[PDB]
């Protein structure tokens, strides 16, 4: 139960309550940020890569 | 005490309003 | 004899579905 | 509980299955999957087979089962205690 659910998230559904975020990179259904469209893992992968505009390891 | 929805203290805790903590 | 844990009594296979 | 400003909820597809019976002289044993439907005063005297996730439990309705959903009368877990 993976690819069929990557597709089924994109579909527009019988009711709008059935709409959930999925990671656009890996397809994770959990811990997804709406700002990026990324899960917390992918987020951290592309971040350290520099491929994430103006994102930067905070520290204070 | 904060478990008491029926007072101003309980409402601040659950962060709501009503008769007992109006806004 | 099918999917995932717990086992259904055949090597590798489990009870689900 | 549902806003009484909004409509007392029945799935519509189950309520029509009823009114027809009322009309052409009820009653067949009516089965459904709408646990979420409210017991409506039309329904009294019928028996409704409500799915519990596994089977359709026969439920005979009476004047005093009216406030409730049909799911209140077909429980979903079988227990019978430890021991």
């Amino acid at each position: 139960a993976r690819k069929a659910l990557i597709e089924k998230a994109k579909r527009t559904p019988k009711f709008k309550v059935r709409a959930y975020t999925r990671c656009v990179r890996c397809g994770r259904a959990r811990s997804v940020y709406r700002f990026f469209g990324l899960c917390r893992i992918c987020l951290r992968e592309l971040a350290h890569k520099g491929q994430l505009p103006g994102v930067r390891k905070a520290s204070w | 005490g904060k478990g008491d929805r029926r007072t101003r203290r309980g409402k601040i805790w659950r962060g709501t309003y009503g008769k007992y903590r109006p806004r | 004899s099918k999917k995932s844990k717990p086992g259904d009594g055949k090597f590798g296979r489990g009870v689900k579905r | 509980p549902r806003s009484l400003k909004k409509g007392v909820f029945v799935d519509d597809h189950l309520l029509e299955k009823v009114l027809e019976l009322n009309a052409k002289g009820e009653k067949r044993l009516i089965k459904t999957w709408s646990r979420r439907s409210t017991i409506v005063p039309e329904m009294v005297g019928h028996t409704i087979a409500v799915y519990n996730g596994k089977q359709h439990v026969p439920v005979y309705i009476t004047e005093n089962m009216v406030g409730h959903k049909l799911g209140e009368f077909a429980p979903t877990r079988t227990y019978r205690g430890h021991g």
Binding site: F36, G37, H48, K49, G50, P53, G54, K57 | - | - | -
Partner: protein, 206 residues
């Protein structure tokens, strides 16, 4: 497993992003997809050129992708015609006016992402892993670098027991932020699983 990404660690210091733009909350993400999808195509199609860094600039309703290829002869093709069929292929994904430069490579033996791919292919082509690492690190230091470290991990030689192999020369101070460490990763598929190849080039400090 412990150590932090050497590049992620120096953004704002020794290293620049690979996408430069601002976008409001209402569509930062949409851009981000295009970007990832962009490099998807190019790292897919232009692997054979030896790709090293896709720099994606944005202003508004247009884009400027800059590809950093080792042999730009493969990028531009027979008379501005390859680079064209792709600058056209990019519009079919971008939609916007996809402006595509090709930038020369300084010294390929000083591109950590390149070294990695050269080693990964050698281990993909059944060469001695330990040897290939000592050779790669030689070629870097000769190209006038101040240090180099290459790390192979996986079923080396097909050994059932997975192993870590590495080799390091010069100096590599991953705790020093003024150090300029080009880092790169390559993946190497084989008949018996996958191996990761990490290449560290120390280019001097600031």
């Amino acid at each position: 497993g412990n150590k932090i990404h050497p590049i992620g660690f120096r953004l704002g210091i020794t290293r620049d992003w690979e996408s430069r733009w601002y976008a409001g909350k209402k569509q930062y993400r949409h851009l981000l997809l295009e970007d990832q999808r962009i490099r998807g195509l190019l790292e897919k199609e232009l692997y054979s050129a030896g790709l090293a860094r896709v720099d994606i600039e944005r202003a508004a309703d247009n884009v400027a992708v800059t590809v950093h290829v080792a042999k730009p002869g493969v990028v531009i093709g027979r008379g501005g015609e390859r680079i064209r069929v792709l600058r056209e292929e990019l519009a079919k994904l971008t939609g916007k006016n996809v402006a595509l430069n090709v930038q020369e490579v300084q010294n390929p033996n000083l591109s950590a992402p390149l070294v990695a791919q050269r080693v990964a292919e050698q281990i993909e082509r059944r060469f001695a892993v330990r040897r290939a690492i000592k050779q790669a690190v030689q070629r870097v230091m000769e190209s006038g670098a101040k240090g180099a470290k290459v790390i192979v991990s996986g079923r080396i030689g097909g050994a059932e027991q997975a192993r870590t192999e590495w080799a390091a020369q010069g100096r590599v101070p991953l705790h020093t932020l003024r150090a300029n460490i080009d880092y790169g990763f390559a993946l190497a598929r084989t008949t018996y699983g996958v191996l990761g190849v990490k290449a560290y080039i120390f280019l001097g400090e600031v």
